[PDB]
Amino acid sequence: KTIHDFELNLICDFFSNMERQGPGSPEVTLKALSFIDNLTEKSLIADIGCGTGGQTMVLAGHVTGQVTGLDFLSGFIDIFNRNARQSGLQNRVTGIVGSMDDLPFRNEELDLIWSEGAIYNIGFERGLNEWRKYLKKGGYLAVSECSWFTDERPAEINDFWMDAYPEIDTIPNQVAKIHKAGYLPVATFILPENCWTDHYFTPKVAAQKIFLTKYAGNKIAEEFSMLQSIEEELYHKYKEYYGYTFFIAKKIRLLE
């Protein structure tokens, strides 16, 4: 009943035609996975804010345990499950609808919680704090998050982020937050520029051309499309100042 309700409609439509809905690459997903040493055929893994599950399918192909993708948008989960079905993976890979502020898991159920380009929806620290209970002792969190690369920056890019997601922070500050939340910062690495360009903005042009033909003349859709363009423009102009960082973190008692 709001522009926002109609908005979610567009977002889903727009991004449904992309293999990923945020910066990343199969190489990056597997690099993060390479730091996790606890997994077996009996492991239970969840991917939070999984989108259509592009990264989840990569993960699933390189682990033997069960993987559950969770996302707020049923349209994304329908695609997730369609793709798992195509790959014959449904014995191990399942997509479910849910909200990351209200996860359905039992305490200490999971060996691994994955989340790429999604924790910002509840906030980095909040996710670190609230998701901890769902992990087995010695289990892992592996999340990619928006980062500043410097302490000072141009007003334009600062203002953009203060409006979009003011919890963006520098990497040393973020590593400190991992530690403070009771996790050992086992690995922390910055995503390459190609995760943003080749693997996200570039496929986004094809998706945008499909979206615009479908929603031609719709005011809200054209606005939404303009915002997407701005996002890419800002990245090309300010990429020296920000990016994504992958944090792989082990839940340990010694840190709380």
Ligand X SMILES: C[S@@+](CC[C@H](N)C(=O)[O-])C[C@H]1O[C@@H](n2cnc3c(N)ncnc32)[C@H](O)[C@@H]1O
Closest CB to ligand X belongs to which residue?
51
Judge whether 66 is annotated as a binding position. Answer: no
Residue corresponding to tokens 């979610």: 8
Q: Segment contacting ligand X (CB under 6 A): 69-77, 187-195, 212-220, 247-255?
A: 69-77
Fill in the amino acid letter for 145.
E
Q: State which H helix or E strand residue 251 sits in.
A: strand 242-251
Residue 250 interacting with ligand X (CB under 6 A):
no
Binder of ligand X out of 36, 59, 76, 235 (CB under 6 A): 76
- If one asks whether residue 188 binds ligand X (CB under 6 A), the answer comes out as no
**Residue with Cβ nearer ligand X (51 or 243):** 51
Q: Which stretch binds ligand X (CB under 6 A): 36-44, 68-76, 81-89, 203-211?
A: 68-76
In order of 21, 97, 186, 207, the CA distances from 104 in angstroms are: 23, 10, 27, 32
Strand extents, DSSP E, 49-168: 66-71, 93-97, 110-116, 135-148
Q: How many residues lie near ligand X (CB under 6 A)?
A: 20
The CB density around residue 77, as the number of other CB atoms within 10 Å, is: 22
**Least distance from C-beta 204 to ligand X, angstroms?**
11
Region for 250 from its dihedrals, namely left if φ exceeds 0, alpha if ψ lies in -120 to 50, beta otherwise: beta
Q: Taking CB under 6 A as the criterion, which residues in 21-60 touch ligand X? A: 21-22, 24, 49-51, 54-55
| 101 makes contact with ligand X (CB under 6 A) | yes
Q: Output 37 or 102, the one with its CB closest to ligand X.
A: 102
